[PDB]
Design a binder for this molecule. Structure first.
Ligand SMILES: CCCCCCCCCCC
Ligand SMILES: CCCCCCCCCCC
Ligand code: NA
Ligand code: NA
Ligand code: NA
Ligand code: NA
Lengths: 46, 46
């Protein structure tokens, strides 16, 4: 258990960070034109 | 239990806040140049 909680302290903080990257990764990387192209894109196929 | 839930009302709100600081602390403190230095940094060692 000297490394087994350090498994869970390393399992969390690589799945937790990947979860938090998923919540926030839309922010990094004109956003009315970036939207209005995609709103035009999706409605055009239907 | 007059203080024991106030333990848990103080345990949460110091671990919850430290969790929420972890989600949001990347925002505070040029971010194309701040990235492109680190993308150059990591690829250069490999
Ligand atoms: C093995 C458990 C280590 C602590 C888990 C706390 C993670 C909280 C995640 C809430 C999104
Ligand atoms: C002792 C429990 C006190 C309430 C816990 C609610 C915290 C929700 C955290 C969700 C990230
Ligand atoms: Na886990
Ligand atoms: Na997790
Ligand atoms: Na707690
Ligand atoms: Na918590």
């Amino acid at each position: 258990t000297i490394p087994l909680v350090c498994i869970y302290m390393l399992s969390t903080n690589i799945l937790l960070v990947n979860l938090l990257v998923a919540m926030f990764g839309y922010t990094v990387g004109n956003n009315d034109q970036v939207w209005k192209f995609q709103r035009f894109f999706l409605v055009q196929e239907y």
